[PDB]
Amino acid sequence: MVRGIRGAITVNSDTPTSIIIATILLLEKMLEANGIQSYEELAAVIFTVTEDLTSAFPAEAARQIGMHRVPLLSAREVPVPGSLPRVIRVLALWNTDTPQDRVRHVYLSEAVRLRPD
């Protein structure tokens, strides 16, 4: 019994500092918005970045906040022309029995335009 948590955030530039900070902020807001106490509830966390973000792996942000024992994997987002630039997307696999409609998903900064809810 697993539920996916989706997250997204943008950055103004492709710098290692800005990528890590934004991922730390996003990751911690998806955890708070679902009342997740310990990292041991996470089966894995998957990241995607757009073509214009290459200066750092988003996985370093998880180790920056103590997710050394959490499996992480990153990949490249589909380069759709005209889509939102410099987006870091997250799919966290949450070990819980929470109903689907009660899982809270977090879209931050310019990435709020991605979902109209």
């Binding site: 950055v11 500092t17 800005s18 890590i20 900070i21 730390i24 920056q64």
Partner: protein, 173 residues
Amino acid sequence: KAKIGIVTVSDRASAGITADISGKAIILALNLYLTSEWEPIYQVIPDEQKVIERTLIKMADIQDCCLIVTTGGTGPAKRDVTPEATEAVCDRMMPGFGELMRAESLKEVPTAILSRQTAGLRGDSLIVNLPGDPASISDCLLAVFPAIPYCIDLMEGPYLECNEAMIKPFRPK
């Protein structure tokens, strides 16, 4: 051990309505920049000029902060009075900081000329104004910090040491 001040100027934040975020990003950025030992002095205060003046003075004169970083209230709105509070507590102004942050944001947003951010020195403490928008804090802090450790050197302050993978400061020999 070095001490760095972080001042968030926001009415809604200090009242408890909204979370800081902007101050959190500044502290996260400093943790990525610095490898040497440092201690954050963090304050959230409303948009009252006299409160900002006292908060900067306490951090610089009482708590011995070699660098104080502010976020919020640097625009043309009526309640935006952070630049005036910074000029009040500083005996000397650093005009190069304000010029650079506007020149970098001007590459992207034309309204960067509406920014009134500035920077100055109170004794041997450096005070720098950052924007209120959390998205702009990383880019703005990253543009000026390469010069900050050498500035604190010239003021006979702590020797800040940086992670060269996150930011590369400049120091002549």
